[PDB]
């Protein structure tokens with residue numbers, strides 16, 4: 035099978051690498067990005083790791099014509115969007131125009147606004163069912179695997195899921211004074227926004243990082259976990275019936291939160307451009323220029339991550355709570371694919387969803403066709419693939 | 433008398449304003465800067481304040497020819513350099529070429545290095561004694577008035593000054609999350625440098641803000657005061673004989689020191705340029721673009737400043753300690769000249785040194801001619817002018 039991937043990110047290095055480790059399903063992996071230096075480093079690395087060999091071909095994913103051009107040049111079974119969420123619509127359109135299969139790991143987001151919303155991508159459901167294709171939205175860890183965990187609970191453990199708390203802890207040490215999980219422009223747009231959660235029909239808003247619980251993360255410890263809006267809550271509230279409260283929490287250190295409140299104070303997190311010696315510059319972009327980009331840090335990053343879902347509900351007129359979670363070692367990820375645990379936990383699920391599609395395990399024939407979030411699909415084989423590809427989960431009743 | 437001033441800074445607004453308030457000595461004040469918007473706001477303000485009327489004429493002080501051109505266009509008695517320390521040599525040269533009188537408020541500093549040193553300006557002593565002119569170096573508050581305080585002590589209170597501690601506290605509240613005394617590019621270059629002090633012949637270095645005493649500032653309170661190198665120590669160690677220890681301390685809040693350590697961590701205090709989307713940008717300059725420039729903040733700044741000199745010594749084989757200091761109110765400064773207390777405490781002394789020169793009170797005939805620091809001149813009339821222009825001092829023995 036043949037598949038084209040857009041993005042040579044920290045995440046991008048993982049998805050490609052993971053495809054090369056499953057050469058039995060991925061014979062033709064073509065890798066496409068704005069800057070080719072990244073793509074050759076991935077290419078050259080995989081060959082050093084023993085993982086076969088990939089096509090590098092530059093393209094500016096913002097221009098739909100050049101994608102259409104690249105898609106039909108290799109006519110692939112699926113295209114993986116692991117570039118920035120801006121390119122979601124431009125790549126998703128070039129998939130429709132070439133009747134090809136699309137998966138991303140992130141919502142749509144416009145550079146001139148810090149809004150998260152599926153409805154721009156969801157609009158393609160008529161157009162996609164029609165062109166008899168599939169677009170699987172948000173197939174990272176969160177969103178994606180967390181949806182799968184909730185999906186998986188809904189089938190196997192719960193009659194009705196009353197509450198959902200997604201909990202994301204990154205207890206890694208990148209050994210630098212201040213650095214980010216992934217691309218700083220998108221990460222820091224996300225976390226500094228007014229957090230948001232669903233309870234009893236209406237959505238509630240909070241000032242950024244207003245709410246905070248302490249949570250005990252298996253294999254780590256007790257950590258301050260702050261409340262955030264996250265993409266998956268949009269799809270999951272719509273798709274999981276019964277839901278009374280749905281929240282997302284993330285751990286941040288004091289040191290991280292301080293740097294972030296300082297940079298915010300001087301204007302370094304600004305999305306609107308500002309003139310400096312003639313030139314018009316966006317601060318938060320310049321922050322990304324200045325900061326080490328994260329791939330660099332996997333070499334010396336140590337720690338583990340824990341991400342998962344804490345659900346309360348009812349099964350056979352009796353109460354039960356479930357915790358599904360995945361722990362992941364930064365050093366172990368480095369030594370497998372040269373990346374750290376955030377690149378890792380995101381790329382592997384996307385490579386899995388690719389495998390689902392190529393295997394027709396997830397199919398537009400033998401289901402409705404069109405645009406779907408992960409919790410809508412058959413998750414059973416997806417979860418089994420996650421185990422096989424390095425994201426084993428725990429499952430815990432109380 | 434006629435005098436030309438280069439700089440429409442926060443400081444610049446004070447020096448011009450203060451000259452207009454002494455119209456009996458300043459009949460022709462011409463004001464020269466890179467951007468004319470500042471100069472008209474000063475012009476238009478003085479007229480609103482009742483202070484007469486000034487000439488605005490743009491010039492790029494980096495190009496010595498255009499200065500020579502501006503100097504001879506109005507042939508003035510003195511030129512006041514209140515632009516950035518980079519223009520020190522270019523303006524100081526155009527003074528020699530036109531045989532005119534020069535005063536600045538800051539050392540020489542090259543944009544590609546964070547070094548403070550008088551020797552680049554001191555080199556002009558032969559050339560200046562020859563052209564029978566005068567260059568008074570560092571005639572702000574610190575440096576400048578503090579030199580005068582030490583000078584004044586040396587004559588009137590001490591036989592030999594064993595120790596000198598200069599103490600600078602700014603207890604103002606500019607009502608913003610983070611902002612700077614003066615131009616952020618120069619301020620933040622200064623404070624984040626390895627501090628330095630003189631004791632027993634050799635100079636000692638310390639990591640930035642390594643050393644810290646608590647000091648009780650009259651009319652304020654007890655404040656954490658951190659040790660810094662400051663320009664005046666260079667000239668004063670050379671010029672005041674007897675000196676066993678000479679230090680400079682400045683107060684910084686935790687909040688300020690945190691912002692500064694964060695910005696330092698991400699690279700926002702960098703003097704070397706760095707490529708971003710083609711363009712090559714200096715971070716710390718961009719920081720200055722981003723931050724409110726300080727003049728803006730005088731409108732709502734409240735608090736007081738205390739700056740002065742704590743000296744121990746011997747007079748008539750008996751020990752004595754002297755504290756000379758000046759307290760200054762941010763709101764009171766706003767309402768007088770529209771500026772805050774740092775702009776104020778710096779501009780007034782420069783306007784005074786101008787008055788000394790125009791009055792021939794400080795003269796190249798009836799003294800050596802050439803290049804001098806403030807402690808080298810007759811300070812008695814200078815101090816009296818400071819009192820008259822709003823910088824009264826206290827003098828305290830123990």
Ligand SMILES: NC(=O)c1ccc[n+]([C@@H]2O[C@H](COP(=O)([O-])OP(=O)(O)OC[C@H]3O[C@@H](n4cnc5c(N)ncnc54)[C@H](OP(=O)(O)O)[C@@H]3O)[C@@H](O)[C@H]2O)c1
Pocket residue numbers: 040041042043044045046066067068069072093094095096116117118119121139140173174175176177178216217220327328376379380
């Ligand atoms: N759901 C999850 O679990 C999760 C967690 C983290 C991140 N994510 C998502 O994953 C992506 C981040 O991956 P990353 O963090 O690795 O980003 P990255 O490190 O910045 O690398 C991104 C890649 O995309 C390329 N790119 C961006 N826009 C492009 C365009 N218009 N045309 C061509 N190439 C383009 C960049 O080119 P340069 O080489 O010139 O930069 C780079 O190679 C984002 O979409 C983020 O929202 C999801």
Ligand SMILES: NC(=O)c1ccc[n+]([C@@H]2O[C@H](COP(=O)([O-])OP(=O)(O)OC[C@H]3O[C@@H](n4cnc5c(N)ncnc54)[C@H](OP(=O)(O)O)[C@@H]3O)[C@@H](O)[C@H]2O)c1
Pocket residue numbers: 438439440441442443444464465466467470491492493494514515516517519537538571572573574575576614615618725726774777778
């Ligand atoms: N010793 C003390 O007591 C003390 C305390 C504070 C500051 N200082 C010194 O005083 C000066 C700071 O005044 P500030 O803080 O008011 O600076 P500012 O607010 O940045 O304004 C500086 C002025 O200088 C102009 N300028 C700079 N380089 C120029 C050039 N090459 N040609 C023409 N105009 C030029 C700027 O033009 P734009 O309008 O385009 O910026 C601006 O009008 C610095 O020299 C600083 O070291 C001394």
